[PDB]
Write a protein that binds this DNA or RNA. Structure first.
Lengths: 136, 26, 141, 94, 38
RNA sequence: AGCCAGGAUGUUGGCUUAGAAGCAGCCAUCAUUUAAAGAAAGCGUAAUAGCUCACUGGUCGAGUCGGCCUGCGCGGAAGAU
């Protein structure tokens, strides 16, 4: 679910995840999920959260999704001795660091909104928090 | 015996499956 | 004397007074004698043209005395009747169906004056308009 | 209509700034006009209360300090990355 | 009664009553709502 | 917070059930005398009924209430001499 259509390379380094997010501001919407936590979001995670949040406001309103995966995350097969090559691509994920906005919402009642994000938050591996756009 | 080698085992499971493909459709 | 000892309200049509699917358990029964009610209501059937609901007090004492005490007929069924739908709102109230004169449901609303319990005549007639959106239709305004 | 407490800063740089932010204060420079910029150590809770109204971002508003009645408009707000707290705010004169 | 890892309310009837060092939940209405360990 | 009463009329709101009636599923929330009262709160009746809610009347007299940033706490918590 939701991976880049084309890629500059088949594989990529583990890297690190030090730092704080830029996307601390609700933009496309008016209501949002700021991250607070730090970690990985697998594509199936953001998807399950999206479903759980979609069946909430139903068809009315709108949901922007800020994060996108592109970080391949490979693994070795079930029981192979170490190091005869780096493993094949397994599942894409989107790394996150605190302050990150996750989901954004269109014209929906704020209480229904807290219902929606209260639903969607449970699927996420990381902790979250509700936020509002601010005029400036 | 188990031994821990990878290809030494999947041959056996391959036989075990290859028979079931016949025995099912019969 | 609106304090009935054992009421079971049930609006009735002009068409019959003693069958079973309309009158009976639907209006309940306990000392009730519908067998005479066929001789009772149908004069009120004869008062005006048939095929309409006629709301009616089910006056019921434990003293064996009981009477129909007719209410003047509801505006909503009358509006489905005039609009001519043979079902209901069906489609959402966003799509209006009925089409009636504006003086109507005010010369038609006035018909219900015996059961209209507001004070101001126009607030009352507007209560009949609430009965109008009750159908999911709205008379031209 | 808004009115604001103030005192001149002397300490500056990341260390002193943290020593303020931990202490329920935050930095906020004030400039505008031809004259030199002047940083101010605002209290936190006060401003955090007052700013919550939207008009605070647009209303002309004073900042009391040494009786000079600085009278300024908001220009920028550094909100904390994930807490209901503030960091730093720009106050351009008007 | 389900013990459950996280009790919370169900019925508005529910009261949330701590006893000893441990949480319990009671409702005058439905019996099913009893809970412990929260 | 408690204690004494009402808590609504047109109207079963149209419909959908052979019978939706506030309460088996929609459309919708529209207009009403009135302290005010949802064409709709749970319980319940096959459907109706019946019984407790928001509002309010007195009684009682003064603190009560929902969230926010916070230090330390409990549950989560099962292993082999």
């Amino acid at each position: 679910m939701l991976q880049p259509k084309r890629t500059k390379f088949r594989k990529m380094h583990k890297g690190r995840n030090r730092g704080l997010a830029q996307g601390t501001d609700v933009s496309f919407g008016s209501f949002g999920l700021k991250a607070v936590g730090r970690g990985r979001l697998t594509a199936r995670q953001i998807e399950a959260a999206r479903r759980a949040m979609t069946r909430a406001v139903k068809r009315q309103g709108k949901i922007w999704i800020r994060v996108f995966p592109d970080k391949p995350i490979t693994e070795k097969p079930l029981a192979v001795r170490m190091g005869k090559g780096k493993g094949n691509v397994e599942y894409w994920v989107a790394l996150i660091q605190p302050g990150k906005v996750l989901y954004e919402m269109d014209g929906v009642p704020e209480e229904l909104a807290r219902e929606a994000f209260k639903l969607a938050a449970a699927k996420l591996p990381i902790k979250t928090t509700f936020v509002t756009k601010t005029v400036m | 015996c188990y031994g821990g080698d990878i290809s030494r085992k999947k041959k056996l499971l391959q036989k075990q499956k290859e028979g079931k493909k016949r025995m099912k459709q019969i | 004397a609106k304090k009935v000892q054992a009421y079971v309200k049930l609006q009735v049509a002009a068409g019959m007074a003693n069958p079973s699917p309309p009158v009976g358990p639907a209006l309940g029964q306990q000392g009730v004698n519908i067998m005479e009610f066929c001789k009772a209501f149908n004069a009120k059937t004869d008062s005006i043209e048939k095929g309409l609901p006629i709301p009616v007090v089910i006056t019921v004492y434990a003293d064996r005395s009981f009477t129909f005490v007719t209410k003047t007929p509801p505006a909503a069924v009358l509006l489905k009747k005039a609009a001519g739908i043979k079902s209901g709102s069906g489609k959402p109230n966003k799509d209006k169906v009925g089409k009636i004169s504006r003086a109507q449901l005010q010369e038609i609303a006035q018909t219900k004056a015996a059961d209209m319990t507001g004070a101001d005549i126009e607030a009352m007639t507007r209560s009949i308009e609430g009965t109008a959106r009750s159908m999911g239709l709205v008379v031209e305004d | 209509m808004f009115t604001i407490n103030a005192e001149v800063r002397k300490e500056q740089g990341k260390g002193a700034s943290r020593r303020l932010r931990a202490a329920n204060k935050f930095p906020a420079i004030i400039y505008g006009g031809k004259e030199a910029p002047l940083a101010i150590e605002l209290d936190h809770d006060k401003v955090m209360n007052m700013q919550a109204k939207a008009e605070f971002y647009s209303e002309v508003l004073t900042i009391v300090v040494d009786g000079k009645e600085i009278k300024v408009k908001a220009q920028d707000v550094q909100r904390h990355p994930y807490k209901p707290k503030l960091q730093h705010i720009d106050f351009v004169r008007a | 009664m389900k013990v459950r890892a996280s009790v919370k309310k169900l019925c508005r009837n529910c009261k949330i009553v701590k006893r000893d060092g441990v949480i319990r939940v009671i409702c005058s209405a439905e019996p099913k709502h009893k809970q412990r360990q929260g």
